[PDB]
């Protein structure tokens, strides 16, 4: 298979605007949302149809209870950070955990936290320790590393449990996650540069580049973002400035899902 990943996010806000949740938790498989929970609904709900069709109500009821507990702990932790920073007003607390099953069979695993959208604590599951960015994170690092058993639990969940969940969700939505829609690629001119655009492709992982007489020139190329089209497919582009004083052989190169494509500009 291609590379796949499973990730869970948590977002906590200390003094949210009226109606805005103070806690949100969303899971992803690759770029697809699969689960959602917030402090307003207080319910864990599917965000992909193949998740709802393969997970019994017992699953959603159980993790709804766990998420209500995780919501309270997140509030206590954000309360503690903002007190240690001596910060007033509204501030954000974020967490991301997940794993990757690479194409060659190897695995990766990660867990980290953020305060106000900046790295705060990063877990190293090989050295079994937390990397702190400042002294407020250092104080939290000391308390978390004193509970050695929970560090071992995180290593096992990242390396064993997370991978098992990923393979499980991968089978549930294999019609979506493991399909291939090749891109449609074209070249047009705009004032003067050559824009090579692709659209209608899945998975979103695509590599587009321009070459001049068979040689890459990355500093010259302008790369566009891979953007969702809204129908499950994606689109992207890449432009390069045209030299009006000398003729050169420009060619857009597109690689997607094991297939390489070359469009020579006449």
């Amino acid at each position, epitope marked *: 298979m291609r590379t796949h990943s499973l990730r869970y996010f948590r977002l906590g806000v200390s003094d949210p605007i009226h109606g805005v949740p103070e806690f949100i938790s969303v899971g992803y498989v690759d770029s697809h949302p699969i689960t959602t929970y917030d402090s307003v609904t207080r319910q864990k709900e599917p965000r992909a149809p193949w998740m709802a069709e393969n997970l019994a109500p017992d699953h959603w009821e*159980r993790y709804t209870q766990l998420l209500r507990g995780w919501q309270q702990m997140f509030k206590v932790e954000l309360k503690r950070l903002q007190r240690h920073y001596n910060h007033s007003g509204s501030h954000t607390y974020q967490r991301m955990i997940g794993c990757e099953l690479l194409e060659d069979g190897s695995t990766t695993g990660f867990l980290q936290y953020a305060y106000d959208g900046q790295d705060f604590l990063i877990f190293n599951k090989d050295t079994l320790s937390w990397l702190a960015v400042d002294n407020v994170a250092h104080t939290i690092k000391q308390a978390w590393e004193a509970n050695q058993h*929970e560090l071992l639990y995180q290593k096992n969940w990242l390396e064993e449990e997370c991978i098992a969940w990923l393979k499980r969700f991968l089978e549930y939505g294999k019609d979506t996650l493991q399909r291939t829609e090749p891109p449609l690629v074209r070249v047009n001119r705009k004032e003067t540069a050559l824009f090579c655009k692709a659209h209608g492709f899945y998975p979103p992982e695509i590599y587009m580049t321009w070459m001049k007489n068979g040689e890459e020139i990355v500093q010259e190329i302008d790369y566009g973002d891979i953007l969702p089209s809204g129908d499950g497919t994606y689109q992207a582009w890449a432009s390069i400035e045209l030299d009006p004083q000398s003729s050169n052989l420009y060619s857009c190169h597109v690689e997607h899902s094991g297939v390489h494509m070359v469009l020579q500009v006449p």
Partner: antibody
Amino acid sequence: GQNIDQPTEMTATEGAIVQINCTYQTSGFNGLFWYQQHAGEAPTFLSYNVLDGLEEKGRFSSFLSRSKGYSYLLLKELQMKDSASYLCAVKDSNYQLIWGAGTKLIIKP
Amino acid sequence: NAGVTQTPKFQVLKTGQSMTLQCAQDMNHNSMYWYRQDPGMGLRLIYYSASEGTTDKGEVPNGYNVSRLNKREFSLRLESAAPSQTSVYFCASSVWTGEGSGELFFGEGSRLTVLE
């Protein structure tokens, strides 16, 4: 389904060594616990294992093998106060605790 | 200091009688549980409370109800006692739930005998 298996009863001599086994078949694994429960009293936490290997805690040691799906609680230099039931419990993928029936340890003075 | 305090220690009941078991913890824990222990089998969860403000059924909820009155207290209710509910009931608590290594702290236990 999910089952936890441990011997019903073990008898050993004072001053000797006893090994209490616990095998588990569960959907997912988030750690194995050992608890001590004296007769007519509440269980109390003894140990936790989640990675492979042996961890020591005084006279008690706890081993875990995730691949074989079994653990043992090792009691050295047995004393009469070690007479109790020893409960093993496993957290599954949904963080639910699945309890073994418990092993009653009888110590011959 | 006190840990988990549950009452009563013993109780005889007639079939159909009502009964409420009390449980309080002073360890500032968030998760509380009600177990029943029977010969020949492991502890079975009746009900649990992952945190203050939420409760959910365990493995054997039928015949029981619970109330997470506050962060400290978690009562178990037997509305119509049945002979099958003759057991030893244990209330427990943990700092949080949904974590691997957090252990349980048990109360002293309540021995109920229900008779026709």
